[PDB]
């Protein structure tokens, strides 16, 4: 009881360190956390032969990006 | 640096009014002040659950707005618009 009320709540921390816990929590919680989908746009986009007949190769056919 | 600011102040003025609230019984007490029994990670990691609904923190809404609007101009930012 007592022993868990002398440990100070972040409210009596001194800003900075509650800024940095602050910073740490916040990635953990929200930047790691946060999910977004783009594996399969990226993969066809790689994928795409680009124009390569309409720019002038004069060359065997030359492998995509994702070759 | 304001947004730890106002969190910790409205820490303050919740720790008082859990004070100021010890008369019925102190079977609540308990499971009111283990947010500040807790460690300064932990209270922090627990105070920040406001993503989604699951609205588990006591983080009033005045307060979570600020960070949700904050996270979504660092998206944007991002490129993740």
């Known amino acids: 009881v007592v022993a868990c009320f002398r440990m100070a709540p972040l409210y009596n921390l001194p800003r900075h360190r509650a800024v940095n816990l602050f910073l740490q929590g916040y990635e953990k919680s929200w930047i790691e956390t946060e999910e977004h989908y783009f594996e399969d746009k990226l993969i066809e986009d790689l994928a795409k032969p680009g124009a390569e007949p309409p720019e002038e190769d004069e060359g065997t056919k030359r492998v995509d990006p994702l070759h | ?81």
Not at chain 2, 30 to 39: I, L, V
């Open chain 2, 1 to 81: 640096d304001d947004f730890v600011a106002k969190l910790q102040d409205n820490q303050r003025f919740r720790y008082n009014e859990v004070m100021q609230a010890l008369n019925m019984s102190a079977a609540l007490t308990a499971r009111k002040t283990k947010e500040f029994r807790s460690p300064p990670q932990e209270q922090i990691n627990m105070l920040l659950n406001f993503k989604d609904d699951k609205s588990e923190c006591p983080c009033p809404e005045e307060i979570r707005d600020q960070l949700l609007d904050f996270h979504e101009d660092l998206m944007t930012h991002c490129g993740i618009e």
